[model samples]
Target chain A: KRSVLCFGDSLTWGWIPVKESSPTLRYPYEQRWTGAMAARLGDGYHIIEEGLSARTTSLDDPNDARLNGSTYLPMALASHLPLDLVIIMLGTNDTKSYFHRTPYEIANGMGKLVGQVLTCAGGVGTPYPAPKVLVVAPPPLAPMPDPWFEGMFGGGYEKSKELSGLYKALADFMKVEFFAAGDCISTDGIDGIHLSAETNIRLGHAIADKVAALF
Target chain B: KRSVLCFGDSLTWGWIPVKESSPTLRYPYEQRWTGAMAARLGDGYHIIEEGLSARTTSLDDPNDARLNGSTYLPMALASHLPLDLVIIMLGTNDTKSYFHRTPYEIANGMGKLVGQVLTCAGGVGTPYPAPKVLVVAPPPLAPMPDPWFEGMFGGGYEKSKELSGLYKALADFMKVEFFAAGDCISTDGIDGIHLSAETNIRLGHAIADKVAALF
Candidate 1:
């Protein structure tokens, strides 16, 4: 069976948008884009998902060391070797105020992650080749209502809007294919960060088309 | 004996700011403003510090539960009952983008914390009077260079400038003393969020003057 790994953050992980602190929840299994991809790809395809909340693109989180996306990406590629494709959707957390990374800097970080995937020894010493990568630029954050998401993601909305163009540039330079999540969906209106169920399903189908196009 | 609880965040914690993330170092004991206060207050005065890394005025951190200032302030006051005075220096972390708090909302949160100090049962059944309170408004964040703290505190500099006035308003309403750290020191030039050695000492002396005035 052909295998694919989907890498991202809370949007890929299916967080139910929340306004309050506690009582975390998730979208149904069937509603996640990864699950959507799984269902759509059907008989001969294997879909794997790796997502975490507040994951960044090649930056160290001051609060938590583990959120750095580059630190573990190579190992992830190796862990699921002989893959046909890998989909990367990150940079949202890199937009956080503490990182101080410009959109170009964030995309540069993405370039590093992409390079790691290209150079990784698929099952080291084996015959498998590097998996084809499709870098997805997540939709820009929606207009957060009064005091909704401005604190952690202040200035993030405009920053995110710029990434689609930069990631496209990076993908072109690296010869990797690119997709824009904004072309298909808006970020969830509630939290202005994660995705809604509708977005998950729609992006799933849209990304499924891109994956199929690659294969 | 006079006991004072110095409540605040990293500025009080004595962090030595660095561009890189690891190997977090603290300023020398005598370098912190709290230490300066201790030294200035001398033998008859007791100075106790309750500072954390990323404390908010009254908001729960999405990443960590303990950073909420209001959640524990009452307990902290009660724990150190019979306190002669309580000095609060917060609102910096509330400037983080995730909190989405405007300067006014941040001041409102500060108001709540001050209210807690005002209404706490000094020792409950023990009959110690409520501690005198001094609200210290942290200095405004300095200009971050290209790609500095703009991610987490993107709009924080301007927002911070507004807080001193709002905090003074709150302090006046609550009948507490108010001291603006800006009146004596600029924030650290390195991190824009912390105090430099010179700032620490200068502010310590200025605040010591305020503390002396309260008595």
Candidate 2:
């Protein structure tokens, strides 16, 4: 049995891009990339969906500290034991203008979470070997015409591009798998963030290809 | 200076409804019920917007405690002291199927918040007269066509219909103003839970009339 955990934020959560106004939304389970990946993988495989609206790689949010990945990884990994793969698709939130984080600092934060996965004890009250990790650098930020969002993601587009190379280096350093989401998808929705249902399916299937090759 | 505070959840926040799938979105400032209330009120009136996406009247959300209205109201009321009126437009989120809250239970929760508003000492250290309170029972839930939403709001429509009477009773007991949004609006969006921009504007103007009469 193959088990994979897609640990990420709003993009993974399938947030619909907002235009002028709307409620907070997430794509359905069957539409999110995780579900698509699960469908492609077929039987004898388990895909754990761990997507939140505002999760950060390892940074504590100004508003909610509990969303930090480093803090949650221990319990998450231990609870879902005997995992085959852990796909870490994070870092978009790290580009927030308020965080004032550099691309390198963000990658280091991802490194911290990767370290957590490697060190976590398994669910059976024992330390079997840790699951393999896949570092995914999401597509760069799109141009946000919305004023509130423009202020929120100031300069995020430029910073996001740097993540691919840095995440690649970090992946090499940690001896884990690596994939750049930009290769197949972009944050092309109207709100300048998140993915459309179509894009989610594409990314899900592409990521599935990567997993199939790895397994 | 006429200062008014509109406190509510996704409706007050202007969450746009998603049909099959869409991103979390909000209507612009000019479109939210709060803003329309402001525009109709005209000059010299300050409208304080205090809307959160998933806020509840008196319940703790299983996902996030910070979203509960009761927990946040003390600080909220205290922060906006010297206020003229406080509008409580909540209870929609209280109908989530998972919460298992009955209509009576939800009304009590709204009552709890009303109590908080009256008891909270003003922004100043001194115990000035608290701002007048207005309780707004949102339009009842519409029949949801989406399966995910249906599961999330089983029997919510019937439960919501019962709230206006209970809330009216509570307001009479508390000696505060009451407005049944159903008299002016309904949860008639595509998703059957949120409001459209047009609906938000309509409710905003209607609430403004209530404020004008109160003054």
Candidate 3:
């Protein structure tokens, strides 16, 4: 089967909010954006789910060891070798309270990750061709739904809102595939940080259309 | 196709470390615990991945709005109806720097989630029967790998190590299927909180054996 590796943070990992009476906290089996992409691709393709929670574009999370996306891409690339494509949806986690990083720095981190994927020894294993990379800029963070979260991500909304432009520039400079998920999807207002199932479904469909054009 | 829902936090969601040169940062498809279960079940069965990053059992995450697993269980149940099984691997997030909850409290939170699954209106969804519940206690936290993580989960190691016993007791009382991922898997030292692909593979295979018995 042709393989595609999806890499990124909670947004790619399918995080759901805790709002009471919401239809379904997470997107259903058939509704996850990845699943949406799967349906569009039909059979003969394998979509590897490599989305991690709390992961960042490239910065190391002072509070958590595994948050750096750039540091892990080589290993991820090696592990999921023979990949036909790698779609990354990240950046929100860098805006966490403790990181104290700017949007430009976060984009730089993403740039570093892209650079590593292009040159890492792990990109193409024996008998496998180098995999293509697609960087997806996540939807902007919205206003905090709860006061408690303000401490953790108070200044993030505005910083996150600026990532699309930064990411687009990086994508153009790096010459990799790029899609702005923020172009069509927005964080669910309930949590102000995560996408609703509806948004995920739409994002998945949009990514699928983009991927189809690549092949 | 028969469906099984895999629910819980980053462990269930497959968080790994950011250390350089780690072999396959995140687990590959066939190696992820859920994927292993799917292979064991073979065709005619579907494994639905609903892992969220930083999710807690039932506690409110002061850092993020939707980290509470309890609040989203109802919606998750409704969205994925006719599920033959619902496996939950959560609680690590409860031990975050700000929560200050004990292992017992974390177990209590988990118990609450099991109760919700058993009784939520979304459980049966008209024609479907109440899905079976499998509560998974995540592997214990190790010593903090980074100084930054100290603030986020400094006192969590000992506290996390105690969860399996408490969770086991809770599962017995709640009458749900139970698995202690810590029984067989341990965190990769690079990030004292997340698993390596090797450990994840083992956990997945073990869970598959447990799940096969239920079928």
**Candidate that scores best on lDDT:** 2
DockQ of 3: 0.04
In DockQ, how does model 1 score against the reference complex?
A: 0.01
Docking quality tier of model 3:
incorrect
Q: Local error of candidate 1 at A206, Å?
A: 23
Instruction: State residue B96's C-alpha deviation in candidate 2, in Å.
Output: 1.0
Lowest-sum lDDT 10-residue window in model 3 chain A: A120-129
Tens-digit lDDT string for candidate 1 (B1-215): 89999999989888776664222588887999998988887878889889888899999764456899899888888888889899999999998754668999999999998888888854666788888889999988876542425555766778899999999999999899999988888886475677777789888889988898777
Which candidate achieves the best DockQ against the true structure? 3
- Order candidates by DockQ, high to low: 3, 1, 2
Computed on alpha carbons, the lDDT of every model, listed in order, comes to: 0.82, 0.85, 0.74
The residue-by-residue lDDT of candidate 1 on A1-215, one tens digit each, is 89998988888888887767335687887899999878887878899889877888788888887898888888788888988888999998888876777787677678778877787754666789988889999999876654645777887777899889888867865678899999989886476777778779889989988888887
Ranking by TM-score: 1, 2, 3
Give the TM-score of each candidate.
Answer: 0.57, 0.56, 0.54
User: Native-contact fraction for each model?
Assistant: 0.00, 0.00, 0.00
Q: What's the true lDDT of residue A2 in model 3? A: 72
Q: Model 3 misses residue B123 by how many Å?
A: 23
Selected candidate, larger DockQ, 2 vs 3:
3
Write one digit per residue (lDDT tens) for candidate 3, span A113-171. 88766764333113345677788888888777567666778688888889999999999
